[PDB]
Amino acid sequence: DANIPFPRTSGARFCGAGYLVYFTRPGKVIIQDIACLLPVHKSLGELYILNVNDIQETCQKNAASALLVGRKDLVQVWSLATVATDLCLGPKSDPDLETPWARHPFGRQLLESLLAHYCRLRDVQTLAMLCSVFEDPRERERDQHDKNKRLLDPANTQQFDDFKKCYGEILYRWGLREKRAEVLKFVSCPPGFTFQCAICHVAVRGSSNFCLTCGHGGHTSHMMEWFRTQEVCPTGCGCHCLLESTF
């Protein structure tokens, strides 16, 4: 074995989200916590409520969490986001009427400044949350007005989507999936016979289950109630569905 860089006996490595491993020669594998080193925290992650309907409630609820955790620049930035996202500043379709809030210096420019600072600080968490929350004839003017209409530049949608993908991957790392769905809800780009019930016979249109073998199905809560106590097909088929439907 000519190519022999053999005597390997030490190594360090990052693993998980908040973890580190290393071993040495005198030899048990010692790991360590680095949660306070990275700019992201799981504790703050579990609390960050998000919503598409009531934006203000999300901002003011996230505001208290950072104070409950210890961070400060967020208990400022979230307040600024709250005051800079009210429906009173709603844009108007006509370009004549009033200057849009985007062109106000405290509008787009503030967003770019915050994004740049937190890009330097390398904190994908706050980037993801801020971006998610803030998300011949005279004809050739309304298009430009709609371009200037938005608080986020239409020419950098890709980076925002990348931020929102990366935070989802880290959330999957941590062990929370519902939050991974809430965050990803904002991303722009996309990701015979026999139709009756079997326990109440009313036509089903939404969520349902069935056996692969039996071929008898119905409403999901119906099956919860039915299989809470028994092990037979509800329609006199004889299948022990706990041995057929599941793997």
Partner: peptide, 7 residues
């Protein structure tokens, strides 16, 4: 008011 008061 937010920008200049009570950090």
């Amino acid at each position: 008011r937010i920008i200049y008061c009570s950090p």
